[PDB]
Chain A
């Protein structure tokens, strides 16, 4: 199950 809170660098 993929992570759900990727954020821009």
Chain B
């Protein structure tokens, strides 16, 4: 469209720097904004720039180059809470239409000191005729590949933060309604390390 951004997830580790670029076409643009949008929530304004240069605020640094019609956003000391999709917006005047970018998704993975991958089998639910498989404590570089046998549902990895015990862990669950479903074949399609403590 009129505003272009990095199309794709920019995965960055906790504490690292996330860099966001943006490009617009209207040389008349005078207002430039950066919006943060957490999954399922509304776009939140986090940065405005009216003159080309550098604007620093917290861990955010916004640059403006009108000559090259370029806008950036540098997120310093990244926190997993910064995980969101960022929208670049620019306008010409108080009556002009706000032009947004597709938005570049930013994933801030957490540091996992002792990756202890495993696939435990939780169970017992007199209400549900399903068995659940929990794949947890793995590394942030272990993407959880989607399922195959349609009758099997697999979620995406999420990061749980044990605030008290100062500990964070990745995880993904898999479940099914078959007497043929076993946690052994559950995450078969995915690329899991050969350190999978498979208790039984």
Residues of A within 8 A of B (CB): 1-2, 4-6
Contacts and interface: CB of A to CB of B under 8 A. Distances in A.
A2 B95 CA distance: 13
Contacts of B156: none
B94 A6 contact: yes
B44 interface: no
Interface of B: 28, 30-31, 92-94, 96
Contacts of B94: 4-6
Contacts of A5: 93-94
Contacts of B93: 2, 4-5
A1 to B, nearest CB: 6
Given A4-B30, A4-B31, A5-B93, 8 more contacts: A1-B28, A2-B93, A4-B92, A4-B93, A4-B94, A4-B96, A5-B94, A6-B94
**Which 8 A-B residue pairs are closest in the complex by CB-CB distance?**
A4-B93, A4-B30, A5-B94, A4-B92, A4-B94, A1-B28, A5-B93, A4-B96
Contacts of A1: 28
Contacts of B92: 4
A1 B92 CA distance: 10
A7 to B, nearest CB: 8
Nearest to A5: B94
Nearest to B50: A5
A1 B93 CA distance: 11
Contacts of A6: 94
11 contacts: A1-B28, A2-B93, A4-B30, A4-B31, A4-B92, A4-B93, A4-B94, A4-B96, A5-B93, A5-B94, A6-B94
B19 to A, nearest CB: 29
A2 B94 CA distance: 12
Nearest to B93: A4
A6 B93 CA distance: 9
Nearest to B31: A4
